[model samples]
Target: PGAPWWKSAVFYQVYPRSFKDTNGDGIGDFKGLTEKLDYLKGLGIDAIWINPHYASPNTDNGYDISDYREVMKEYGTMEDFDRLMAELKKRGMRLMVDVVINHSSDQHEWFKSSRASKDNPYRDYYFWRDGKDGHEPNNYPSFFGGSAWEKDPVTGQYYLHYFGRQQPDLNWDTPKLREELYAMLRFWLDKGVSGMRFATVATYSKTPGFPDLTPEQMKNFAEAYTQGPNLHRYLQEMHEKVFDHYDAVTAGEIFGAPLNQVPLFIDSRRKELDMAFTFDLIRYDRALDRWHTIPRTLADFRQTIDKVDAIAGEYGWNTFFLGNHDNPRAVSHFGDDRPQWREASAKALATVTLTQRGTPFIFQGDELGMTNYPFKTLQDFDDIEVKGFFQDYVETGKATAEELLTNVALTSRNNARTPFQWDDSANAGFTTGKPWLKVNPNYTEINAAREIGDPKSVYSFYRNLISIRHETPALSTGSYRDIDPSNADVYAYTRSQDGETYLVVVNFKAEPRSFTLPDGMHIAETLIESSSPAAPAAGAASLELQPWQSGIYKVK
Candidate 1:
């Protein structure tokens, strides 16, 4: 297959509410994102993919979809979306909407019908089951917490919900239910949405015995949410039914996938998705019960990428990301976000991301080296998942409130949801009215207005980094080889194609490190660098790097 546009394009993920607010309702809308398209294009992005903005009750943001056809009133009307889509077309940019098909909002008409009565024809649309032993359907816990089953007070039957009670899981076993999803997908495809970012799509096909398990099983996220038995069949059918007709790019959040099975979900020969995001790497830091997350190490980092590369080397493909809307900022998670090293470390991380063997995505505000929210109390939180953890673990006797806040500070979803820092203006120039979320206090120094023109700024570095990737063929389609997989402080790799090779070496620490190049290749061009004596690497020379250093060089 020829390289799809998505393969060469740089994706920018816009969390609408935090991107910009035009009407000052403290919420970002279609108009707000439309206004920012020029800004995104200037950053050298080829497409814009946004989080859900469909009509929703805002329980879990917009993931709990109540209406797929209508845009959320808070995010503007369909007319505004049309304009946004038209504008993107003019700039040669594509639109990818977040599609949450694994479940629907409890308030959705289908769910309402399914829950209205046991005799309802739509009862088969969701996982409605009788109580087991008068307790619950099974021992599965929700991704948030608590049992996965919820009793319908009106119908006297329990329904399954993998996340929140407000979001009920969809049953994929029924032909009618599967057809309903195919129709919804076609509705958007016909509307000119050229891509679909599937929200936990792999969980759609989970056929359950709902077996019980211990803390050990649950910590690994159990198979119910992973690639279920019927997963491949459903995905293949979805493609045959709706996807075959469109050139739409598809990606899924396969957070629970087993590493080997990942290729089955996205390999071109499989006729499934184009690419999938696995939590395999990120899970190392997080505990099964999200309330506890440990700091990750450099060797573990190398292990994660090496594993993914192994999978992609033979069959499938992967997408690159350091952090996104669901996690803390990359600068905060893996890099030193302190004032002294913020710019260098952020650029260093970007160097590794763009040079890797995957299509790269940069979350909004990431280009400015954004850090985590400066949260003083849980009161500053707005994400549903964060609040649920605090209530389930902290407010109860399970964990102290202090302990909850301490760990959450390092991994809260709200960290990435904080308003985009455009400038030092009031409210970070995001809105004239109060922002839905607080702007990070560091906006005064880290805002984009200050960085766009400065070569040393994070924004400029990202723009140039994107440019370098597009210019260097070795990065996009080349083979990747880890030079020092066991190196504790230094992570280095080489990309080669058409007899041209490039090397990328990153110091995942805050101290000096030595990188000995692969046997016969010496770096001849210091095309990209953030710190250290990275001017050039002569033959057989070992380069000494400064703290928080990263370099990309042409190998000859």
Candidate 2:
């Protein structure tokens, strides 16, 4: 694959609401982020992706954006955001803002005008249709539950909102809306921001037929929304108009897109985005009862990596991931939730992902081996999806509210939204007042202040991993080959560039296992070692990995 600038870069995603609360309003703000520039700079990250800070009704926790030109009061003013951008550039780090164009808050001025009258100039700004037989045009369910259509008492029409009723889906088919969106994008790029992580970018365009989905398909879409036929057209226009104008990078959060379509969207020929975040790895632990269920095993994950690598390699595009703000922590998902496998799994995931054939993004607290918190009730939840899931699935009889709430407590987006644990103190030293969301209870023992100084800490391991990826050209722009997918507990792969080769081996099992290398593979150096001890190599295969051990070996 032709490597893009981001292919060798490491991006960090910051969930603004909980990243740092500067004004003690119990919520994270841009000023706090500005102050943390030095802290992020120390991590050696190449880019920082900040979640939405736009004006909103907070219905979808700022996903339902009411204004595109202004920063929300909770986050700070536009001048404050400008200062943060300047500081990031001064430090030689790129800044990527989250772009939520799939929907707008019901309170948005465009939606307000569109809902005011049928003949309103902005009527076409949002999806609107007359009721069919006193019901919605179709039975398509909103992502947040209930009917996708909400009747407007003023206009006697129903508008589409794929998420909460308060979030009205934009009409991408309208040229005016597309022009405005592109203009707004240029506004930010003009302000010197480096890139954007497009939120639900492909969803505004709908299939022409709007056909009723099969019960099977409906069940699948209920979990994650996808782009329809016209999505590519809109994306192409967006690419040609705004994204292509600058050298800024763009990654899309396009759910349910076919694997075959990734290159079409992200390839360097500039058809669409620079990269896309695929959910294949994140969905590994989803219940089989769900429509998008996949087999859960180390072998399956390795196969997925291979498949994505092969496709990206063929199409000249790159992939992006580590973990993100919208999902639970990686340690909790791939590692044993218990204390023993915590650090091991964290290191293992970092080792494998950082050495892959694409850009890697690390969510905050990931370097410290942060695990998911145990929230017991709905009151502890903060993400819109979790709250909506509770109302829709739990209350609708698919599962009890309590059971759903328990699941949310374990796996909700809020798990990633918890305040960043800075030190071993009250509120994890994140704030003086109660946090907007609860801090992870393990903050006292697992935090940045302590780990930054400890060489043996998970944070230090991540630092070394990042340093290696940045320093070794072979690991950065290499060709990836999966080694052993069927080795139930072992996730192994190799990256080779020019004449140098790098091998990453991770043990995901509870018990130790050993394997011999193929002929001509000799250990050149021990780049990284997990808690498990390693001995001096005697021959071609003297390396023995303990339970949950990981190693990065350079081949001679």
Candidate 3:
């Protein structure tokens, strides 16, 4: 947190498979990314977080890494990756690779050897447990929705896989495995790469007992497993061994960690991670009975941000995100899927997130105001989570295949995995051949090439918002305080530090709303506006805001 490059930097997350394709192989690659370096530089991002491009069978979309040292054939060779790093460095931007250390592909040499026999030298590399009472070791469920343990016919035991069956979780308890992971980290750092977006860093360490969940907590437990006893030990070891040696930034995908433990994970003195991404805001729309329920009011979204930020503030933990590669597009979540509101919502969210007390992470295509793609069939789906849910519902008779498929169209990986809409050409100009996944149909109107030059375009709006964050000190490192929680249509907050204060008020409704600012607060510069007019009179009097309007004002 102390002058770290990431603290002031804006990270752009690139999903390699869907970013762009150079060879027309229908899959995005490193070469294609290198071609776009100038474009990214133009956007003013400080760093690029490339999703996994390691050798794999495409299981879990590169999360099932087969080889940590080599780039996947579909992406390119080590040379291509090196060229990309050089290109980004020349543009004054850093590059962070996705480090999938929690698990390795079953096809990996280590896993293959471990499965060869019980006495195999690599046996301890993974979590292998003998079947209990002629059944699987435990009733734990995999993230992809089945038994967490898969039997190994040759070894006559089962290995734990928190995700897909092919992705076997590594045994962090083994010193050898821990050392090997550090070696992999060094391999990248030594190559001049900036850092890593560590995948599920908190999941490697589990409680010693690894007990099954109680029936009452089964539903919640199935959704996540985190903050195991050994998490801190393993994280601290990683920090001391690899991260500390390189001066690199690391942001981890830490899920389900208790609120009290967040500070420890992100403590700069402890040398853990630089920042951590929590999903408390991402799932605000999910209902108790179903995962697809959408939030119907602005207050709902505002409350979630307030709760998460309050917790983060208590621990001095840095926050990240508006949206990511794994979630539905933010435009679809906050807007009514119309062009006018789409642009406004994107800018509004950017205004809110960038002005917060944390580094901001922007997903690819977000600048162009992208929305979730609509899928019509199960065959159109590509993510493991969607497929697993569809299968689960059908198998249990909770829903028929058709009904499950219908639900999948509304909430599935297909929505988020669509190709980046670069231009209006074939396949959104992402590839010459059919893209690996479907491109969003709105590409004709929403694309980078078209919006970058338009001053009022969503892309330009994002640029201005980012620039404000970089230029304004008060917005970057300030205390955040929610303004009004009772308002059903407006989201407002104040940030103050060292006698400097700024108030951000956003109207999330379709109609006008009015609110009074705290005493001594006054209107300053209209940092951002969305179909709203600010009054010239500058006092803590009643203020009016039009639909989707947002204002950033200074307080004396």
Candidate 4:
């Protein structure tokens, strides 16, 4: 009964740029989201986690902030943002805004001034390093596929940028810069956001020295950038100075930190973040390079989740999500996207995520079972990362254009950035004007309007599952146990709390699977099932599941 409000809540992530376009300007705005407030409420989620809508140069799609205290003009005025917040509060919902303090757009005033001259007052606001022998300060590779250092002709020095050249990494060790960031946090909190999603929060602190590494070590450059000596010290200070004053939760995009170090970030005793998002589950099907694809299986997926769950049980909290804007569509990545199994597999995935112990995040359009877009060429993609990768692989003779396209098809961020399919209208009803990004061609067959009233649709299944979760205490705050670790194709688990137990079984494959109930556990009632003609009626000890089928049963 004393659990935190967020522990029982489900967050709906909205990439505003693609969610809706009410102005016919071809980009989503606060007013467009305000128009669809009822649609979000219908989904039964408790809160919304809107991606960065702050003023940006659109380099990293708003991840590179230019004006922290202002809303992007394309996303509407600050007044529009305030109205959206008011409307969400009216519906008893909350908001969580993404904070991208790890870096800022190079066009920002501070960056511009810092790059002007060597002795500029704002020079210390970012990482500026002297060139080593007229080359980059170090061999650290950018996450977006280049040297992490950018040479400025005006200043005759290099600045660190883990992302794009337009995004310069901030110097978190600078007291003035940290205070400004703290003030930005207060600005939003005072405006009434319930939480903040810290973008690449672990990347805040870089290694003390900008040391060079071998090519083999460069593959793990991401790991080398995280959990620096000053990371915890800075977080604790921010907690006391900014976050402590407000009753808000912080969700850090923690990458590369080992599971053993998770407690240092989110443990309540540490006074850092409240939870973290690790890429282990989402990246299981891909290689470290992200451009290279790999085979995926239900066994690997289950094991990844099991590891996170173990850490949560022993240490602190974790988040359960399939994918976000930076990755491929969840349905396409985690579940089969073929027409035959699409609906069922989507429902199966929802069942697994909703019944898990951590807070579940449903990316926009995922409820309608969105699939990856069919890109015929590079021109169809818009993500900066894609263009950077194309230059790195195809231009450098490391890979053929065709080979890069094949890899892009499997793992491009554009797979998740397509405009949200609201209906079967032109541009998928996302915009009457040309969409910022192309709408998926299959929208007619798969959209919110098409599935809203269909009880058998994935959309309806998610809504029902959320209702079930809200009513079932054990499902929200239960001790998780893997039912059968040896059986990989079938994911079976139990959530037990205060003698009330629930069994969740999902067939992750496209074929049928058989599962048996653990000894001494009896099914008392069938709470929910993904497909029709749900099997394993109450009192049944063994069950047969259809392709991509899932069910949750009350156990005694």
lDDT of 3: 0.79
Clashing pairs in model 1, backbone N/Cα/C closer than 3 A:
none
Ranking by lDDT: 4, 1, 2, 3
- lDDT by residue (1-556, candidate 2, tens digit) is 4566677888898988888888788899898888988988888899998889899878777888999999998999989998998899899999989999988898899988898888999999988887887788777887666788888889788888888899988888899889999999999999988878888765767767466677777766733356576777888888898876898888887676667767777776756887878776676567633312234787777887777776675446565565677777888877775887787778877887788888888899898889898886657775666656756676778887666665565567777888999899889888888898888889978999999999888888988888988988778778888877777777777889988888887788878777677677878778777866664373455456788888888887
* Model 3 ranges with Cα > 4 A deviation: 222-224, 288-290, 294-296, 313-315, 533-540
Top of the candidates by TM-score: 4
lDDT of 1 at 55: 93
For 116-210, candidate 4 gives per-residue lDDT tens digits of: 99899899999999999878998888878778898888978899999898999999989999999999899999999999999888889877776
TM-score on alpha carbons, each prediction: 0.97, 0.95, 0.95, 0.98
Which 10-residue window of candidate 1 scores lowest in summed lDDT?
A: 532-541
lDDT of each: 0.84, 0.80, 0.79, 0.87
Runs in model 1 deviating more than 4 A are 214-216, 537-540
TM-score of 1: 0.97
Q: Alpha-carbon error at 487 in model 4, in Å?
A: 2.0
TM-score pick, better of 1 and 3: 1
lDDT of 4 at 304: 77
Clashes of each: 0, 0, 0, 0
* CA error at residue 298 for candidate 3, angstroms: 2.9
Collision count of model 2:
0
